[PDB]
Amino acid sequence: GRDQESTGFAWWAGNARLINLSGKLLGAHVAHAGLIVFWAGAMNLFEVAHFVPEKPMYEQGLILLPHLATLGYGVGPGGEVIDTYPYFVSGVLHLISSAVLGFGGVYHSLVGPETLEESFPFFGYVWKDKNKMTTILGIHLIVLGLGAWLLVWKAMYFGGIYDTWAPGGGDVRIITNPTVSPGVIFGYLFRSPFGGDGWIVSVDNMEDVIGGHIWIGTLCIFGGIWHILTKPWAWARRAFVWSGEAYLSYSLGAISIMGFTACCMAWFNTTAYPSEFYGPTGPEASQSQTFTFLVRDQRLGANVASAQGPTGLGKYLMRSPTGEIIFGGETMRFWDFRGPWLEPLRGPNGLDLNKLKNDIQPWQERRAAEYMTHAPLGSLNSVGGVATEINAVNYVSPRSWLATSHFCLGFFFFVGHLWHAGRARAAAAGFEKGIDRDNEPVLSMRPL
Amino acid sequence: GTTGRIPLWLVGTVAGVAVIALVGIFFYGSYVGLGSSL
Amino acid sequence: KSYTYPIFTVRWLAVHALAVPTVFFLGAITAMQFIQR
Amino acid sequence: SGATGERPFSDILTSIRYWVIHSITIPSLFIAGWLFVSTGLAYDVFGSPRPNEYFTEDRQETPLITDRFNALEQVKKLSEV
Amino acid sequence: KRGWFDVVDDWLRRDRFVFVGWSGLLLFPTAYLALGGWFTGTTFVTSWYTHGLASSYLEGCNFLTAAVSTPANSMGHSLLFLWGPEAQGDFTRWCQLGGLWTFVALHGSFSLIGFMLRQFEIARSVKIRPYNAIAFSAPISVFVSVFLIYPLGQSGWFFAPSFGVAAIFRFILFFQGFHNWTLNPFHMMGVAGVLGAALLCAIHGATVENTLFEDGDGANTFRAFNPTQAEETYSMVTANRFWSQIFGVAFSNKRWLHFFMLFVPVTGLWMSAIGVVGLALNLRAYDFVSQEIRAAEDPEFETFYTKNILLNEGIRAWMAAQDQPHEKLVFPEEVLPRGNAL
Amino acid sequence: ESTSLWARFCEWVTSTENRLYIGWFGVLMIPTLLTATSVFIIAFIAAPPVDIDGIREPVSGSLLYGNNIITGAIIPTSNAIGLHFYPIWEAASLDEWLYNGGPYQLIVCHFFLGVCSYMGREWELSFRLGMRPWIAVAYSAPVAAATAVFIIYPLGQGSFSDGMPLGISGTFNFMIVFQAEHNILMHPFHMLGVAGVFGGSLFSAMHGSLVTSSLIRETTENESANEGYKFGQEEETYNIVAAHGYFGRLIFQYASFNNSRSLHFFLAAWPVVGIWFTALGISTMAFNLNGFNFNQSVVDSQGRVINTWADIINRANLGMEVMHERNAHNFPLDLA
Amino acid sequence: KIDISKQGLNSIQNETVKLNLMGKSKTMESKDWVDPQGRKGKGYGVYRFANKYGANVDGYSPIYTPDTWSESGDSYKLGTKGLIAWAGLIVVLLGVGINLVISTSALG
Ligand code: CLA
Ligand code: CLA
Ligand SMILES: CCCCCCCCCCCCCCCC(=O)OC[C@H](COP(=O)(O)OC[C@@H](O)CO)OC(=O)CCCCCCCCCCCCCCC
Ligand SMILES: CC1=C(/C=C/C(C)=C/C=C/C(C)=C/C=C/C=C(C)/C=C/C=C(C)/C=C/C2=C(C)CCCC2(C)C)C(C)(C)CCC1
Ligand SMILES: CC1=C(/C=C/C(C)=C\C=C\C(C)=C\C=C/C=C(C)\C=C\C=C(C)\C=C\C2=C(C)CCCC2(C)C)C(C)(C)CCC1
Ligand code: OEX
Ligand SMILES: [Cl-]
Ligand SMILES: [Cl-]
Ligand SMILES: [Fe+2]
């Protein structure tokens, strides 16, 4: 490789020596891609091996199998795992594919061309070439659009996607009428992120989920063709820093947002993250507790509608500040929660009192009872329950792992934007190494 | 006698592995035997 | 040109005053990991 | 800068003699630590209860030292097996 | 022909790898025993007969829960020597009596004196000013007040902080429940000192790194420096103008900035030490009587202070039975303050 | 030279001749921080009691309502609101907005935008002055901590009522309840946070004392040593080699930074990295990934549980748990 | 000033390591040198005030100076005789150590 003597970058900034070595930089990105596919394959096989059918997915610390289950692999009605062979071939296919991906990373890094600009003009690039940069942006934009179309093809032609809201119980369902209306799509995008609205985390149909991925697939393809046939305009040329480190900082800021959104998706959403596989959400578990005690106290004999708590508010049932009848207690904050087991008891005005005291099905009680005990509360060493609990249950919700981890990744990659974007501007301006001793800018300014 | 020196990076590597092994045993012992709640 | 250093010095005592007991204690703590209630 | 007259650590940690000597000394100290615990000597020297010695038939609750000038006698009775 | 003092002084103050000095005669013996006492206590010594707890690796604790626990409250403020009337020469019984705590506390307190004398000793030899020793008075004030003065004002060593991670956490939560130590204006000044010093450390380190002069052609700016360089490595003028336009006020004197970096942390720990001295006598800033009178008379007046007062009552009642086994507090559950449900 | 209004406006905004730099992040920072400052001062002095728990039990937090400076606070939004957006225009009356804890959301929302813009404004001035752009990165650590206790923790818990109250005694209530529900002391990230501030306090004292100890004699004893430094000096005001010699003998030669640039990076990295992790710790505990739970970890041969110091902590945690929000829980589990 | 020849780095086998430990770079001294990020140098080396002071912090106080190492450390004096005895002693102590661990445990 290189050294600090000829590059000025120490070993701990060693990968910064690849900024203008496009050929070696290619192998670096292909090799990390092989690692990602390797982890997906290795972790998939690890979870399949450690999978016992006597427990649900969320009780076994599995985070990849739920993603396969939501795609509708090896799951029967009600979120029951019937066969884990589809999970096996997913792990094997990734594991083997990482080998060839790893070979290309090692080849393009150690013994391939150092710079592609001479031998391979198609793949060669210089960061300053805005036209060439947009073509690469355009090309990889099309493959992302095609990847989105794979999801809708899976949901419409190849088996289908697991729908937790399906009539007759949650099951794998073919999506035949995706929601592609502009008002629905724009409604999710420009919705508030606050309570009740929840931005895009509040998508509650598989019709809307795969309806959106139709828009994303189409926009990315048209955007790919657009960014291939056009070079950036003057307004863009005078707004962005056109350097390799600058382009990296743009992506770091972008996937920081995506990391935070995935954190909130795993924590609140119950459609793309069915509770059958990822376990109950925070709001779901709190809502399940009052539902469980409402059911068991009715059998002991009590009018849940007329029951008062110590504070005077309804012990079991109260009204939200908008008027809907909701569960009482502290779970009054989670009144905007919607779940497959709870919607049948909910009418236009909120929870229906008649259905709550006459038509509570056993499966609804069992779901709420299970969700309450598997509430997303646990310790670092995976001790289930509140901090003031004994070492009895070994459980932490997959939602807790997914939300907690991808927030830390989201925040650190925001510091990546702050770091790599600050340095990109300074290096381009030309003072990333320090202030010129003979030409200090402040020395030429009027005193304050 | 025998001329030679152990490379420093090899010393760091073997010592680094031994430390990692020692920490792993401590974390292993956290889940078994005494102090494991079992 | 040629350097000859003493083997046992104040530094030697300091390094062994802390290293010897540590390795012993590390051995003792490792043995504790395999004790069953 | 300079040096204080001691041999450079890098020189000693790269020399063959050091590893020949410490390939026995360090392992032996570890084994001695292991035997100090496995032989039960750690319990006896420092008086920590064995996993089956916390409670007795006489005392099924936690000990309590309720005397200062007879604490030596009292702790012997609490520690009696 | 030199006398004993001169020949010994020559050897003690020899410029070796680890400087010994005259203060090393007090530091290294006591510091080694304090370190050894803690490692030995956390590995083999139990607190079963002093606190009714396990506090060693041999008993099954980990680094977080192992500790060198204090003697039982019946011992009072006994110095608890190996040869004292308690555990009269019996080493194993001495460990079971918590005598290792006073061993670590005492040999540890003389190590702090030895280390501070070491700072004076080296500074005089190197011919510099003694402001590092003065800065070290603040940690000594914290150790002296927390580990010595506070238990001396209480019933005994039992209520001193035990040398451990979780043991310190129990000591911390004890101070909230029983002393309302957060409300004390002296912990408040201590917090401002520690948080302010952490702010100064970060803000000064970043300011220097981002006002560095270009003294090289490499992106690695660490190499473009020489400890013997006469020119400054960073632009104070740029730094001063940056913080004047960002924060409104900035340092213009390099000497003042570094003294402030020393005054904030030291003053904070010293102020915090005064508060713990007050808690030694239970002379605590527990409550505001005016609000307590108002709250008692008006059952609808609630503030976050009154909410904290109820939290302290929960801490005291649910913790006293096990944290203070000498009191033999058998509280039936009906008498423990408990809110609705939970 | 510039004749266009926007060309002249953009020159004034980015002008480095202003007493306080405005910049483009300042057109966002100034209005948001002034809005939050105005309502905070007004609410801290004259706001009516706020029903924080949603149980129709208002909590007084204003000076004119019987609080002092220590006990005064801006009470968080009502638990009935939850995470729902509650601007003043979504309330029927300004009395209702005050009763439900409206001012808290107005402050927190505008304040979060202010610190994010303050962070960008720090980058912008560095770019305008031609200095290296990473003071804003060091400022991301306190921003993350402020964002964690005002936004992310309410987000995960499901209500703005679980945010940190804007007051002194309100802060203590936040910490005590946080320990009872998450065992933050046993979390490795508050442990890293404590090492960040204890270490940062140590390093600030050491660096300050070492530089002060090495001041080159340039004054008399009837004058402040500070007078020996002239603002704009091209030469060094203290002897770095002398300070390194002292600290080298204090522990050992290679435990000291001979390099001022490495030393100052360490002075910046240690507290910033520590505060990054403790900010993450609160963020992770927002989604109920609590600290270490070693309760009943040690059991004897026959199964009897031997208590440790962790169990004594649990006893204190138990007391806070059963007393916080006394009238708010109707069911045994504190899932919310 | 500082003399780099008397700093103990003269016997480094690798030239790049020797230059890095010396805080020197002949490549970066040229005014046509270009950074990996594309920035051209200003004619300074790793340190501009070098020559004035003699070296940078890297050459001022190295932490790896093989010139000051003892020549006796380059070889084991006992030679093959010691190594064979060392190899035999290792096996004997390994067997005793394993047996003592097995004997003093509840295993089997
Ligand atoms: C995803 C992680 C990753 C990847 C993909 C790379 C990739 C690369 N690095 Mg880098 N680096 C990394 C992490 C990574 N690095 C980290 C964490 C650090 C900090 C320690 C560094 C520090 C660093 C420095 C200082 C330098 C590089 C350099 C390089 C480039 C050339 C390396 C070389 O040729 O030397 C040769 C390496 C070897 C001969 C040993 C590796 C042999 C193989 C690759 C090991 C993998 C075996 C694998 C299991 C085989 C399976 C493949 C297939 C058969 C299935 C290369 C593209 C160099 C460079 O910039 O080029 C100018 C260089 O200067 N890196
Ligand atoms: C300079 C090192 C040093 C220092 C300052 C201390 C200090 C201390 N040790 Mg420690 N100790 C040390 C080294 C040191 N030790 C060493 C090397 C060991 C062996 C490993 C020990 C082992 C040890 C144990 C086992 C114990 C202590 C204990 C103590 C504490 C009380 C004991 C005491 O001083 O009573 C006696 C006071 C004096 C001796 C005053 C001395 C004044 C001079 C010497 C008088 C000259 C005598 C001379 C014959 C003149 C006769 C006068 C005539 C009137 C009789 C005390 C704070 C006890 C403790 O920890 O408390 C819990 C304890 O149990 N030490
Ligand atoms: C654009 C948005 C502006 C953001 C707001 C910034 C606030 C500015 C606050 C600075 C006022 C403090 C004056 C220090 C006194 C002063 O002006 O001295 C000025 C001093 C300059 O010292 P010199 O370097 O000139 O010293 C030369 C010698 O003569 C020293 O004596 O600046 C500093 O010391 C830096 C410390 C600033 C940090 C101040 C500490 C934080 C303020 C605490 C506020 C308390 C809270 C009140 C709430 C009710
Ligand atoms: C460049 C470079 C780098 C990196 C590299 C990389 C990152 C690579 C990767 C690589 C890779 C990424 C590789 C991979 C591989 C894979 C493979 C080779 C596979 C295998 C498989 C098998 C063999 C089989 C398996 C199986 C099945 C089939 C079923 C089940 C069962 C089992 C599991 C057995 C580094 C850092 C060093 C630095 C220097 C430079
Ligand atoms: C799939 C799906 C969906 C969705 C879809 C879509 C359609 C999305 C889109 C989205 C879009 C379509 C967009 C977004 C975003 C964008 C952004 C977020 C950004 C912006 C940025 C920036 C960066 C700006 C900048 C600026 C400019 C102007 C230039 C320079 C200067 C500045 C920098 C200032 C839904 C929901 C149905 C659900 C289901 C699934
Ligand atoms: O709101 Mn404020 O503090 Ca969070 O845990 Mn559940 O909810 Mn209520 O209780 Mn505990
Ligand atoms: Cl409370
Ligand atoms: Cl409740
Ligand atoms: Fe400084």
mmCIF file of N, CA, C and O in Angstrom, chain A residues 157-206:
data_model
loop_
_atom_site.group_PDB
_atom_site.id
_atom_site.type_symbol
_atom_site.label_atom_id
_atom_site.label_comp_id
_atom_site.label_asym_id
_atom_site.label_seq_id
_atom_site.Cartn_x
_atom_site.Cartn_y
_atom_site.Cartn_z
ATOM 1 N N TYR A 157 -47.113 -10.904 -7.036
ATOM 2 C CA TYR A 157 -47.035 -12.005 -7.987
ATOM 3 C C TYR A 157 -46.372 -13.244 -7.406
ATOM 4 O O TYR A 157 -46.676 -14.363 -7.827
ATOM 5 N N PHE A 158 -45.466 -13.070 -6.451
ATOM 6 C CA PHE A 158 -44.684 -14.178 -5.914
ATOM 7 C C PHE A 158 -45.107 -14.421 -4.471
ATOM 8 O O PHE A 158 -44.486 -13.935 -3.529
ATOM 9 N N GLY A 159 -46.169 -15.194 -4.301
ATOM 10 C CA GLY A 159 -46.589 -15.591 -2.975
ATOM 11 C C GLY A 159 -47.339 -14.519 -2.217
ATOM 12 O O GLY A 159 -48.486 -14.724 -1.816
ATOM 13 N N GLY A 160 -46.704 -13.379 -2.005
ATOM 14 C CA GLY A 160 -47.312 -12.283 -1.282
ATOM 15 C C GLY A 160 -46.512 -11.917 -0.044
ATOM 16 O O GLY A 160 -45.463 -12.488 0.255
ATOM 17 N N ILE A 161 -47.044 -10.942 0.675
ATOM 18 C CA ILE A 161 -46.428 -10.407 1.878
ATOM 19 C C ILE A 161 -47.336 -10.718 3.057
ATOM 20 O O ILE A 161 -48.562 -10.744 2.926
ATOM 21 N N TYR A 162 -46.729 -10.985 4.208
ATOM 22 C CA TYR A 162 -47.511 -11.246 5.406
ATOM 23 C C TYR A 162 -48.273 -9.989 5.801
ATOM 24 O O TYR A 162 -47.673 -8.943 6.058
ATOM 25 N N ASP A 163 -49.594 -10.095 5.857
ATOM 26 C CA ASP A 163 -50.458 -9.002 6.274
ATOM 27 C C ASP A 163 -50.978 -9.315 7.667
ATOM 28 O O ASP A 163 -51.662 -10.323 7.863
ATOM 29 N N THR A 164 -50.641 -8.462 8.632
ATOM 30 C CA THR A 164 -51.121 -8.665 9.990
ATOM 31 C C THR A 164 -52.548 -8.174 10.167
ATOM 32 O O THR A 164 -53.190 -8.518 11.162
ATOM 33 N N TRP A 165 -53.058 -7.388 9.220
ATOM 34 C CA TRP A 165 -54.417 -6.871 9.252
ATOM 35 C C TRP A 165 -55.359 -7.674 8.369
ATOM 36 O O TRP A 165 -56.481 -7.231 8.114
ATOM 37 N N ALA A 166 -54.919 -8.824 7.883
ATOM 38 C CA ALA A 166 -55.708 -9.567 6.916
ATOM 39 C C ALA A 166 -57.011 -10.043 7.552
ATOM 40 O O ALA A 166 -57.019 -10.455 8.717
ATOM 41 N N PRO A 167 -58.129 -9.978 6.833
ATOM 42 C CA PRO A 167 -59.376 -10.541 7.359
ATOM 43 C C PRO A 167 -59.232 -12.032 7.613
ATOM 44 O O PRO A 167 -58.606 -12.755 6.836
ATOM 45 N N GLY A 168 -59.823 -12.491 8.709
ATOM 46 C CA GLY A 168 -59.690 -13.872 9.112
ATOM 47 C C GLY A 168 -58.433 -14.193 9.882
ATOM 48 O O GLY A 168 -58.151 -15.375 10.107
ATOM 49 N N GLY A 169 -57.676 -13.194 10.292
ATOM 50 C CA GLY A 169 -56.424 -13.400 10.985
ATOM 51 C C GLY A 169 -55.238 -13.058 10.104
ATOM 52 O O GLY A 169 -55.305 -13.119 8.870
ATOM 53 N N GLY A 170 -54.137 -12.680 10.744
ATOM 54 C CA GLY A 170 -52.918 -12.380 10.025
ATOM 55 C C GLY A 170 -52.416 -13.564 9.227
ATOM 56 O O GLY A 170 -52.375 -14.686 9.733
ATOM 57 N N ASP A 171 -52.043 -13.330 7.974
ATOM 58 C CA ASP A 171 -51.590 -14.408 7.108
ATOM 59 C C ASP A 171 -50.847 -13.802 5.929
ATOM 60 O O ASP A 171 -50.895 -12.593 5.693
ATOM 61 N N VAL A 172 -50.140 -14.660 5.196
ATOM 62 C CA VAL A 172 -49.535 -14.240 3.942
ATOM 63 C C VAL A 172 -50.638 -13.953 2.936
ATOM 64 O O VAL A 172 -51.538 -14.775 2.725
ATOM 65 N N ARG A 173 -50.573 -12.787 2.309
ATOM 66 C CA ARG A 173 -51.652 -12.318 1.462
ATOM 67 C C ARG A 173 -51.077 -11.721 0.190
ATOM 68 O O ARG A 173 -50.044 -11.051 0.224
ATOM 69 N N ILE A 174 -51.744 -11.978 -0.926
ATOM 70 C CA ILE A 174 -51.402 -11.331 -2.187
ATOM 71 C C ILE A 174 -52.021 -9.942 -2.202
ATOM 72 O O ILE A 174 -53.225 -9.786 -1.971
ATOM 73 N N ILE A 175 -51.202 -8.929 -2.462
ATOM 74 C CA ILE A 175 -51.690 -7.556 -2.533
ATOM 75 C C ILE A 175 -52.138 -7.296 -3.966
ATOM 76 O O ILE A 175 -51.321 -7.273 -4.885
ATOM 77 N N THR A 176 -53.438 -7.096 -4.158
ATOM 78 C CA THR A 176 -53.989 -6.934 -5.494
ATOM 79 C C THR A 176 -54.328 -5.493 -5.838
ATOM 80 O O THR A 176 -54.414 -5.161 -7.024
ATOM 81 N N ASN A 177 -54.537 -4.637 -4.844
ATOM 82 C CA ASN A 177 -54.919 -3.244 -5.066
ATOM 83 C C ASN A 177 -54.000 -2.338 -4.262
ATOM 84 O O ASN A 177 -54.409 -1.769 -3.242
ATOM 85 N N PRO A 178 -52.753 -2.175 -4.693
ATOM 86 C CA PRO A 178 -51.863 -1.235 -4.008
ATOM 87 C C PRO A 178 -52.397 0.185 -4.107
ATOM 88 O O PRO A 178 -52.995 0.575 -5.110
ATOM 89 N N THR A 179 -52.181 0.956 -3.048
ATOM 90 C CA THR A 179 -52.685 2.323 -2.974
ATOM 91 C C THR A 179 -51.653 3.254 -3.592
ATOM 92 O O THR A 179 -50.634 3.568 -2.977
ATOM 93 N N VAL A 180 -51.918 3.703 -4.814
ATOM 94 C CA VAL A 180 -51.002 4.563 -5.544
ATOM 95 C C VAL A 180 -51.582 5.965 -5.724
ATOM 96 O O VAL A 180 -51.102 6.730 -6.553
ATOM 97 N N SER A 181 -52.605 6.308 -4.958
ATOM 98 C CA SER A 181 -53.203 7.634 -5.055
ATOM 99 C C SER A 181 -52.215 8.694 -4.583
ATOM 100 O O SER A 181 -51.574 8.515 -3.543
ATOM 101 N N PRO A 182 -52.051 9.794 -5.320
ATOM 102 C CA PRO A 182 -51.100 10.830 -4.879
ATOM 103 C C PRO A 182 -51.419 11.409 -3.513
ATOM 104 O O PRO A 182 -50.502 11.706 -2.743
ATOM 105 N N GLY A 183 -52.699 11.576 -3.188
ATOM 106 C CA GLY A 183 -53.052 12.149 -1.900
ATOM 107 C C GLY A 183 -52.624 11.280 -0.735
ATOM 108 O O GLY A 183 -52.168 11.784 0.292
ATOM 109 N N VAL A 184 -52.779 9.964 -0.875
ATOM 110 C CA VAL A 184 -52.361 9.046 0.179
ATOM 111 C C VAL A 184 -50.847 9.058 0.330
ATOM 112 O O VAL A 184 -50.319 9.107 1.446
ATOM 113 N N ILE A 185 -50.126 9.011 -0.790
ATOM 114 C CA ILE A 185 -48.668 8.969 -0.736
ATOM 115 C C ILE A 185 -48.121 10.272 -0.174
ATOM 116 O O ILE A 185 -47.291 10.278 0.742
ATOM 117 N N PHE A 186 -48.586 11.401 -0.711
ATOM 118 C CA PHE A 186 -48.133 12.693 -0.210
ATOM 119 C C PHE A 186 -48.602 12.933 1.213
ATOM 120 O O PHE A 186 -47.958 13.671 1.964
ATOM 121 N N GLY A 187 -49.722 12.325 1.599
ATOM 122 C CA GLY A 187 -50.191 12.465 2.966
ATOM 123 C C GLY A 187 -49.223 11.884 3.976
ATOM 124 O O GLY A 187 -49.014 12.454 5.047
ATOM 125 N N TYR A 188 -48.621 10.741 3.652
ATOM 126 C CA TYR A 188 -47.640 10.152 4.556
ATOM 127 C C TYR A 188 -46.337 10.936 4.555
ATOM 128 O O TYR A 188 -45.741 11.155 5.613
ATOM 129 N N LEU A 189 -45.876 11.368 3.382
ATOM 130 C CA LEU A 189 -44.579 12.027 3.291
ATOM 131 C C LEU A 189 -44.531 13.343 4.047
ATOM 132 O O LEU A 189 -43.554 13.607 4.754
ATOM 133 N N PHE A 190 -45.559 14.176 3.915
ATOM 134 C CA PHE A 190 -45.564 15.502 4.513
ATOM 135 C C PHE A 190 -46.459 15.572 5.735
ATOM 136 O O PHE A 190 -46.968 16.643 6.074
ATOM 137 N N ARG A 191 -46.661 14.446 6.396
ATOM 138 C CA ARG A 191 -47.351 14.391 7.668
ATOM 139 C C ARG A 191 -46.412 14.845 8.776
ATOM 140 O O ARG A 191 -45.188 14.789 8.641
ATOM 141 N N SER A 192 -46.991 15.311 9.867
ATOM 142 C CA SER A 192 -46.203 15.705 11.023
ATOM 143 C C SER A 192 -45.550 14.478 11.641
ATOM 144 O O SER A 192 -46.099 13.376 11.554
ATOM 145 N N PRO A 193 -44.378 14.616 12.254
ATOM 146 C CA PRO A 193 -43.780 13.499 12.996
ATOM 147 C C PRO A 193 -44.285 13.337 14.421
ATOM 148 O O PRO A 193 -43.800 12.449 15.124
ATOM 149 N N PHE A 194 -45.233 14.155 14.865
ATOM 150 C CA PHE A 194 -45.660 14.132 16.251
ATOM 151 C C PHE A 194 -46.727 13.065 16.473
ATOM 152 O O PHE A 194 -47.071 12.292 15.578
ATOM 153 N N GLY A 195 -47.251 13.027 17.696
ATOM 154 C CA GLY A 195 -48.185 11.981 18.061
ATOM 155 C C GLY A 195 -49.457 12.043 17.241
ATOM 156 O O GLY A 195 -49.928 13.112 16.854
ATOM 157 N N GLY A 196 -50.009 10.868 16.962
ATOM 158 C CA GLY A 196 -51.197 10.776 16.144
ATOM 159 C C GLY A 196 -50.871 10.792 14.669
ATOM 160 O O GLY A 196 -51.512 10.101 13.876
ATOM 161 N N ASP A 197 -49.870 11.582 14.290
ATOM 162 C CA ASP A 197 -49.449 11.673 12.889
ATOM 163 C C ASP A 197 -48.312 10.696 12.609
ATOM 164 O O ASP A 197 -48.457 9.779 11.798
ATOM 165 N N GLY A 198 -47.184 10.872 13.287
ATOM 166 C CA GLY A 198 -46.093 9.926 13.176
ATOM 167 C C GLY A 198 -45.406 9.855 11.834
ATOM 168 O O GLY A 198 -44.732 8.862 11.558
ATOM 169 N N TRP A 199 -45.546 10.880 10.993
ATOM 170 C CA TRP A 199 -44.912 10.921 9.678
ATOM 171 C C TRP A 199 -45.205 9.655 8.880
ATOM 172 O O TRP A 199 -46.368 9.284 8.710
ATOM 173 N N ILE A 200 -44.158 8.979 8.398
ATOM 174 C CA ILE A 200 -44.333 7.768 7.603
ATOM 175 C C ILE A 200 -44.348 6.510 8.451
ATOM 176 O O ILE A 200 -44.657 5.429 7.930
ATOM 177 N N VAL A 201 -44.016 6.613 9.737
ATOM 178 C CA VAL A 201 -44.067 5.472 10.641
ATOM 179 C C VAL A 201 -45.490 4.998 10.883
ATOM 180 O O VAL A 201 -45.693 3.901 11.410
ATOM 181 N N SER A 202 -46.480 5.782 10.474
ATOM 182 C CA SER A 202 -47.878 5.476 10.723
ATOM 183 C C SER A 202 -48.558 4.763 9.566
ATOM 184 O O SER A 202 -49.788 4.668 9.562
ATOM 185 N N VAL A 203 -47.807 4.271 8.584
ATOM 186 C CA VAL A 203 -48.404 3.507 7.495
ATOM 187 C C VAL A 203 -48.982 2.217 8.067
ATOM 188 O O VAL A 203 -48.279 1.445 8.724
ATOM 189 N N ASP A 204 -50.275 1.980 7.833
ATOM 190 C CA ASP A 204 -50.992 0.925 8.540
ATOM 191 C C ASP A 204 -51.683 -0.057 7.603
ATOM 192 O O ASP A 204 -52.614 -0.747 8.023
ATOM 193 N N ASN A 205 -51.265 -0.128 6.345
ATOM 194 C CA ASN A 205 -51.788 -1.113 5.413
ATOM 195 C C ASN A 205 -50.642 -1.646 4.577
ATOM 196 O O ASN A 205 -49.696 -0.914 4.279
ATOM 197 N N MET A 206 -50.731 -2.915 4.188
ATOM 198 C CA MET A 206 -49.790 -3.418 3.198
ATOM 199 C C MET A 206 -50.104 -2.867 1.817
ATOM 200 O O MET A 206 -49.234 -2.853 0.943
#
